[PDB]
C-alpha cells in the first residue's frame, strides 16, 4: 500500500518542563517538551516570549538542564522513548538560531525488562555523571568528561529490582544517589555512592529507613539543608541520616502529590501538585546553630489553591508559575501574597490550549457551507470538555467531567455525548463538583428491572455514566440521562434502523465490577430525543460488554465481549438477533464498508468479515496473523485496512489461487507514528491524494492519512531519501530509525508510508538546499519549482 | 482495576505501553483455571516442544513419530494450516529441540546419536553433528548463533561451533560416568551454563573451565532451567518436589509441593511463567499440570497456584510464551495442550473453574 501521513495539529499536551539559562547565561528560559516538540521561551516580565521550537525524531522521555564547569550556559540532555540520548547546546550567532548536538548515542540494552515505574533520568548536581533507570535491576551511568571523544556508559547492578523513585543528593563529596524502592517488607529509602573508577555502588552516607507504604516521590534538598524529602500519600518525611522529621498534614490526604518544583534556590519553598489540580506550598524552616550550619526545624504544607491538573510545575519569576498539563489546558498562574475572597493565592494569568487526550471525535458540517468541522472529546476529569475545530480555530465547551463517546444527530440538531464523573460513596454516591451531567436543563435516571437480582464501601471512587444531549448551536446540555449504578457506557451510535423512520441514540453499556476480569452483563438501550425529551424506546440485555456498535445497512452490528453480533430492528421496535461470530478474544473495534466488517481485537490484530445477505450469516474473509495490541482500526477502502497498535505504530493491511493465501491480510505498510491513536474518522477540514482519514491521539495531536498512487509514492520516497541527507536532525537521530516500526517483539523499517511532515519541511529550507535536494531527480529532469508545486499541492489537503 | 474496561479507559487516557503488562499480570494472577485447546498432527508421543525466540511466533515440536513439526501458532489455533514438517527426519525418538537467536535455524536431537540443524525458512537440512549416544539437551548460545551445547547419555556435555562443522571436533565442557539429562546456557551470561545430571545433581559450569564446575547445587536432577534474567535455577528431581536455587547460594531457595504431584516414571521438563518469572510450572504422573507461585518473601511451598487438568496421560514438557501468556504442554499422548488466560476458537474451561 501507498499512504501519506501529516499532522494537522501538533501535539499540545506538555510532557515535561524545565527552567534554566539555556539560550543565554543572563536570560531565564522555559523549555517545554510536548511529545516530539521542544519549545524554548524566554521568560520576560511581559509574559513568555517564544524563542524557538524544534522537532525531535523521538518521544522526549527525559529532559534535564545541566551546566558542567567551563560552560557559559546550560546544556540540555534529552533521552527519547527509543533510547536516543543527546546533549545539546544552544548557539545564536547573528540572526541564525540553531541547536548544536554536543553528544549523541543510543543507550538501549540488548537485554533487560523496562521498569514498571518508567524511564528515569537524573544528573548529578556537580555534573559528574548522568544516571538512567531504564530496566529493572540495572542503573546506567554516563560519565561527563568533556576532555574526551567517548562517553563510556556502563551498567551497575541494583540489588533492588522495583525502584519507585531516585534522585542525586546534594553536597556530597562523591556522587550519591538516594532512591525509594519496594520489597516484600514494604517501601524503603536507601542511599548508594556511585564509584566511577570501580563502576559500582558503595555504602551510602546514611543507612536505609522505612518510609510510607505509598512513598513515591523523592526530592533532593539543596544546600545548606541537604538530605532528601520523601513524599507519599499520608505523610511527608525528611531524612539526612541522624536527622529524621515527619509530618502528616491532613490537607494532602484527599489526593496524591504527583509533581514538585523548587521555588527558592536554597530549598526553602517547594511547589507540590496533586492529581485533582490542587497546588500546595511545602515550607522548610531553618535554625542557625551557634557557629555552625543551619538545620531543618519543621515542615509546613499550605494549600496555595487550585490549578489545572498538572503533569509538571515550574516556577518562572516574580511569583509566576507554569503548570504543564496532559489532561487539561496548560496554564500560567500568579502566586499572590494575599489571598482573595475565596482564600485562594492562585489567580490564572494565561491558558494554553490542549486538545489531548482526544478519546473520540466526529466530523460534522454545522454551518452547512461544505467545510467540515471536528468535534472532539478532550481532557478528563474536571478538565474534560468538547473541542470544536475548524480551519486552525478551536472553541472550548467545558464539561467538568470525562467525555467518552460523541455522535451527531442532524435530524435532532444535537450531539449525544457519553460522559463519566467520579463520585464518593459518602452515605450512596453524593458528588465531587457540579458538571455538565448535573447542570442539565432536564435530567432522567435509568429505571431498568434487569440486573436487580458487588459489594461497596464508605470510601470508594466510582464512575457515574451519563448520556448528554447537547444543542449544536449553543452547546448547552439540553438533557442528561444517568445509567444504572456500576454501569459504564462504552459505545454510542446514532442511526435509523430497519423500516423505522425515526433516528435513535443507541448506547451499549456493560455492568462493570472491579473484581471481575470481564463483564458478564450488559445492555443495548435505544433512546429517542423527541420534542426536548429523551425517552427509552427499547432495551436489550446481553451477556457481556458492548464494546462497539455500528449501523449495518439498517441493522445493528454490536460487539459483546468476544462475539460480533448482528441484530435487526423489528416492526414492534425490538432488536432481534440475526447472526453471530465468535472467533475472537475481544472485539473492541468495528468498522464497515458495504457488506464488509473490519474487527479490531485486543491482541490479535484485525479481521475482515463479510455479511452474506443470501445466507444470513457471517464469514471470515481474511485475518491478519501478526498478533499486536490494537487501539483503533479504519477501512481506508475496499482493499486497504489501516490500524493503530498500542506501541505508537500504524500498519496498513491488504486483502491479498490457493484459498489459504487468499485468507491472509498482508501487512503491506508499517510506520512509527510516535503517538497513541485513540480515534479514527473519515472527513476533512478543508474544502495526488485519494481519501482522507483524520485520527486523534492521546497527546492532543490530530493527524491526516491519505492514499497515494505508485508514481506519487515513488517520487515522495525519493524526496524523503534526498531530504534526510540534507535536513540536519537535532540529536543526530536517523529519520529511518525514528520511523521504523518498533515493538518489543520485532523492529522493522517503515514501508508504504510517506512522512508528510518531512516532505512539507522541504518548503522551509533555503534555496541552495532546495536545489541540491532536487538534483538528477528522474522523464524531464525535475527542478526546484516542480517539487515546490508538488509539495504545496500536498499541503493543500489540510 | 481488575476489569478490562478500566484498563481500556486508562490506556486510552494515558496511552502508555506499560498498562498492557500490568493488565496481563493481573489477569493471570486472578485466574483459577485456563482456557484449554488441543493441537493435532503428531502420530506418537511428543517429547520436545519449543516456542520460537522473541515472540513465540512458531512452535517446534518432535517426538516418537521422528518428524520435526513447525506449528504457526496463530494459523494453527484457527485451524487454517497444517504443521510444516521440516525435511530431514531422525532415525529414532526426538528428545530435544532448539531455535537460534533469530529463529532462522532449528537444532533437533535425540536417540539417534545425531543432531540435525534445519533451515526453517526453507525447511531443509543444513547440517548434521554426530554423537556417541542419545542426546537429551540442546542449548544455543544467546550471543553466538553458531555455538550450541549438547548433553548426551554417555555423560558428555559438548560445545559445538557449526561454523566449523566439516572438521568435527566438539569441545567437551563436561564428562561424567552418568547420563547428562539437561544443559542450558545462561540467558544473560553466555560463559555460564547449567547442567542437570542423573547422578551428580545440578551444576553450574564455566566455558573457560572445561572440567571443574563453578558450583554444585544441593543428588539427582533430570531438568534445570534458568529464568529470563538468569539469576535463578529451577530443577526437577527423580522423586522429589521441584526446587528453586539462587545462582550463587548453593542451597535450596524453595521447594514446591502439592497433593497428588509425583515425578518418577518419565523424564519431564519445567519452566518459569509470568513476565518476571514469578511462576513455576511442572507436569506430574497424575496427568495434571501444576503451577506454583514463587513467594515474594523468602522452605516448602504447599498448594499449587493452579492444577490444570485435561491431559489424558503423563505430562512431560511445559513451555511458556510470555508475550501472549500462553502455555504449551505435551507428554505421552500425541496431542499438544494449549492453556491461555484468553479465549481461543474451540476452547474448554474458563477463568473461574
Amino acid at each position: 500500500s501507498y499512504n501519506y501521513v501529516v499532522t494537522a495539529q501538533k501535539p499540545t499536551a506538555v510532557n515535561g518542563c524545565v527552567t534554566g539559562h539555556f539560550t543565554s547565561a543572563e536570560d531565564l528560559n522555559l523549555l517545554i517538551a510536548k511529545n516530539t516538540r521542544l519549545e524554548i521561551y524566554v521568560v520576560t516580565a511581559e509574559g513568555l516570549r517564544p524563542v524557538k521550537e524544534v522537532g525531535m525524531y523521538g518521544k522526549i522521555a527525559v529532559m534535564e538542564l545541566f551546566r558542567p564547569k567551563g560552560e557559559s550556559k546550560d546544556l540540555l540532555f534529552i533521552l527519547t522513548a527509543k533510547y536516543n540520548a543527546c546533549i545539546l547546546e544552544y548557539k545564536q550567532s547573528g540572526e541564525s538560531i540553531d541547536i548544536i548536538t554536543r553528544a549523541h548515542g543510543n543507550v538501549q540494552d540488548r537485554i533487560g525488562r523496562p521498569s514498571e515505574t518508567g524511564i528515569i533520568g537524573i544528573i548529578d548536581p556537580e555534573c559528574r555523571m548522568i544516571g538512567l533507570r531504564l530496566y529493572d535491576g540495572l542503573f546506567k551511568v554516563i560519565p561527563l568528561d568533556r576532555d574526551n571523544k567517548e562517553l563510556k556508559a556502563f551498567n551497575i547492578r541494583l540489588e533492588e529490582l522495583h525502584v519507585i523513585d531516585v534522585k542525586f543528593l546534594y553536597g556530597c563529596q562523591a556522587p550519591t544517589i538516594c532512591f525509594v524502592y519496594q520489597d516484600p517488607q514494604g517501601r524503603h529509602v536507601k542511599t548508594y555512592e556511585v564509584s566511577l573508577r570501580e563502576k559500582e555502588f558503595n555504602k551510602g552516607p546514611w543507612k536505609q529507613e522505612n518510609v510510607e507504604a505509598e512513598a513515591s516521590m523523592v526530592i533532593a534538598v539543596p544546600e545548606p539543608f541537604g538530605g532528601a524529602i520523601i513524599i507519599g500519600q499520608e505523610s511527608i518525611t525528611y531524612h539526612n541520616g541522624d536527622k529524621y522529621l515527619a509530618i502528616a498534614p491532613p490537607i494532602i490526604k484527599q489526593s496524591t502529590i504527583v509533581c514538585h518544583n523548587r521555588v527558592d534556590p536554597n530549598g526553602s519553598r517547594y511547589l507540590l501538585g496533586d492529581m485533582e489540580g490542587r497546588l500546595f506550598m511545602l515550607l522548610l524552616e531553618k535554625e542557625e546553630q551557634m557557629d555552625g550550619t543551619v538545620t531543618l526545624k519543621d515542615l509546613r504544607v499550605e494549600l496555595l489553591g487550585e490549578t489545572s491538573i498538572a503533569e509538571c510545575l515550574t516556577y518562572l519569576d516574580n511569583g509566576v508559575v507554569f503548570v504543564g498539563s496532559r489532561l487539561g489546558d496548560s496554564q500560567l498562574v500568579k502566586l499572590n501574597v494575599d489571598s482573595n475572597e475565596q482564600g485562594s493565592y492562585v489567580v490564572a494569568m494565561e491558558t494554553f490550549t490542549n486538545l489531548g487526550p482526544i478519546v473520540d471525535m466526529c466530523v460534522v458540517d454545522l454551518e452547512r457551507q461544505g467545510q467540515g468541522q471536528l468535534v472532539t472529546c478532550s481532557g478528563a476529569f474536571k478538565e474534560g470538555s468538547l473541542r470544536i475545530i475548524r480551519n486552525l480555530h478551536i472553541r472550548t465547551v467545558p464539561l467538568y467531567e470525562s467525555p467518552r463517546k460523541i455522535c451527531y444527530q442532524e435530524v435532532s440538531q444535537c450531539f449525544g455525548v457519553l460522559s463519566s464523573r467520579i463520585e464518593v460513596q459518602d452515605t450512596g454516591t453524593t458528588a465531587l463538583r457540579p458538571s455538565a451531567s448535573t447542570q442539565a436543563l432536564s435530567s432522567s435516571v435509568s429505571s431498568s428491572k434487569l440486573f436487580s437480582s458487588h459489594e461497596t464501601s464508605f470510601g470508594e471512587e466510582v464512575e457515574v455514566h451519563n448520556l448528554l444531549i447537547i444543542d449544536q448551536h449553543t452547546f448547552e446540555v439540553l438533557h442528561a440521562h444517568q445509567f444504572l449504578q456500576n454501569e459504564y457506557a462504552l459505545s454510542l451510535v446514532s442511526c435509523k434502523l430497519g423500516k423505522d423512520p425515526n433516528t435513535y441514540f443507541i448506547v451499549g453499556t456493560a455492568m462493570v465490577y472491579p473484581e471481575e476480569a470481564e463483564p458478564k452483563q450488559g445492555r443495548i438501550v435505544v433512546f429517542q430525543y423527541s420534542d426536548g425529551k429523551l425517552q427509552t424506546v427499547a432495551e436489550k440485555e446481553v451477556k457481556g460488554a458492548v464494546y462497539s456498535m455500528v449501523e449495518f445497512n439498517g441493522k445493528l452490528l454490536a460487539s459483546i465481549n468476544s462475539t460480533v453480533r448482528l441484530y435487526e430492528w423489528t416492526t414492534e421496535k425490538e432488536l432481534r438477533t440475526e447472526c453471530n461470530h465468535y472467533n475472537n478474544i475481544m472485539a473492541l473495534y468495528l468498522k464497515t464498508k458495504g457488506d464488509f466488517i473490519l474487527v479490531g481485537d485486543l491482541m490479535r490484530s484485525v479481521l475482515l468479515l463479510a455479511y452474506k445477505p443470501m445466507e444470513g450469516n457471517f464469514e471470515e474473509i481474511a485475518r491478519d496473523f501478526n498478533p499486536n495490541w490494537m487501539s483503533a482500526v479504519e477501512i481506508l477502502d475496499d482493499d486497504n485496512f489501516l490500524g493503530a497498535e498500542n506501541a505508537f505504530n500504524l500498519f496498513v493491511c491488504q486483502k491479498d489461487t490457493t484459498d489459504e493465501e487468499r485468507q491472509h491480510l498482508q501487512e503491506v505498510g508499517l510506520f512509527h507514528l510516535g503517538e497513541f491513536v485513540n480515534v479514527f474518522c473519515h472527513g476533512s477540514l478543508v474544502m495526488p491524494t485519494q481519501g482522507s482519514v483524520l485520527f486523534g491521539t492521546v497527546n492532543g495531536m490530530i493527524g491526516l492519512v491519505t492514499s497515494l498512487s505508485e508514481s506519487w509514492y515513488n517520487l515522495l520516497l525519493d524526496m524523503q531519501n534526498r531530504l534526510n541527507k540534507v535536513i540536519k536532525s537535532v540529536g543526530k537521530i536517523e529519520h529511518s530509525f525514528w520511523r521504523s516500526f518498533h515493538t518489543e517483539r520485532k523492529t522493522e523499517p517503515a514501508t508504504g508510508f510517506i512522512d508528510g511532515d518531512l516532505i512539507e519541511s522541504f518548503l522551509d529550507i533555503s534555496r541552495p538546499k532546495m536545489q541540491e535536494v532536487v538534483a538528477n531527480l528522474q522523464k524531464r529532469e525535475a527542478t526546484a519549482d516542480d517539487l515546490i508545486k508538488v509539495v504545496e499541492e500536498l499541503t493543500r489537503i489540510h | 482495576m481488575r476489569s478490562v474496561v478500566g484498563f481500556l479507559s486508562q490506556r486510552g487516557l494515558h496511552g502508555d505501553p506499560l498498562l498492557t503488562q500490568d493488565f496481563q499480570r493481573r489477569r493471570l494472577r486472578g485466574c483459577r483455571n485456563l482456557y484449554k485447546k488441543d493441537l493435532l498432527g503428531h502420530f506418537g508421543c511428543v517429547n520436545a516442544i519449543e516456542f520460537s525466540n522473541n515472540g513465540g511466533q512458531w512452535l517446534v515440536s518432535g517426538g516418537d513419530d521422528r518428524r520435526v513439526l513447525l506449528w504457526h501458532m496463530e494459523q494453527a489455533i484457527h485451524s487454517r494450516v497444517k504443521p510444516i514438517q521440516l525435511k530431514g527426519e531422525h532415525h529414532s525418538n526426538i528428545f530435544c529441540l532448539a531455535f537460534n537467536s533469530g529463529n532462522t535455524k532449528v537444532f533437533s536431537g535425540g536417540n539417534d546419536e545425531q543432531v540435525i540443524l534445519h533451515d526453517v525458512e526453507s525447511s531443509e537440512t543444513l547440517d548434521v553433528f554426530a554423537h556417541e549416544d542419545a542426546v537429551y539437551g540442546l542449548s544455543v548460545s544467546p550471543v553466538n548463533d553458531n555455538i550450541f551445547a549438547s548433553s548426551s547419555d554417555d555423560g558428555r556435555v559438548l560445545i559445538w561451533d557449526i561454523r566449523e562443522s566439516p572438521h568435527g571436533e566438539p569441545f567437551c565442557l563436561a564428562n561424567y560416568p552418568s547420563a547428562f539429562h539437561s544443559v542450558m546456557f545462561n540467558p544473560v551470561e553466555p560463559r555460564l551454563l547449567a547442567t542437570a545430571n542423573s547422578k551428580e545433581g545440578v551444576g553450574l559450569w564455566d566455558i573457560r573451565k572445561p572440567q571443574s564446575s563453578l558450583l554444585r547445587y544441593g543428588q539427582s536432577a533430570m531438568s534445570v532451567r534458568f529464568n529470563s534474567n538468569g539469576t535463578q535455577l529451577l530443577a526437577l528431581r527423580r522423586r522429589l518436589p521441584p526446587v528453586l536455587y539462587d545462582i550463587h547460594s548453593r542451597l535450596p531457595v524453595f521447594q514446591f509441593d502439592n497433593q497428588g504431584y509425583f515425578n518418577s516414571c518419565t523424564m519431564k521438563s519445567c519452566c518459569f511463567a509470568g513476565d518476571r518469572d514469578q511462576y513455576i510450572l511442572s507436569g506430574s504422573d497424575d496427568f495434571n499440570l501444576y503451577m506454583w507461585r514463587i513467594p515474594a518473601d523468602p522452605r516448602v511451598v504447599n498448594g499449587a497456584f493452579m492444577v490444570l487438568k485435561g491431559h489424558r496421560s503423563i505430562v512431560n514438557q511445559v513451555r511458556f510464551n510470555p508475550h501472549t501468556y500462553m502455555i504449551c504442554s505435551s507428554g505421552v499422548e500425541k496431542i499438544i495442550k494449549i492453556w491461555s488466560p484468553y479465549k481461543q476458537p474451540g476452547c474448554t474451561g474458563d477463568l473461574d473453574g
Binding site: 554536543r102 553528544a103 548515542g105 543507550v107 540495572l138 574526551n148 | 551470561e189 563453578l214
Partner: peptide, 26 residues
Amino acid sequence: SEQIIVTEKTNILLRYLHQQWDKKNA
C-alpha cells in the same frame, strides 16, 4: 557532535558471582 555515547559491555552477573563467592571466605 564532539562526542558519542557507547554503552560498553560489562559482566554484571559474573562480577556479582565472583564478589559473592569471595565474600564467603570467613
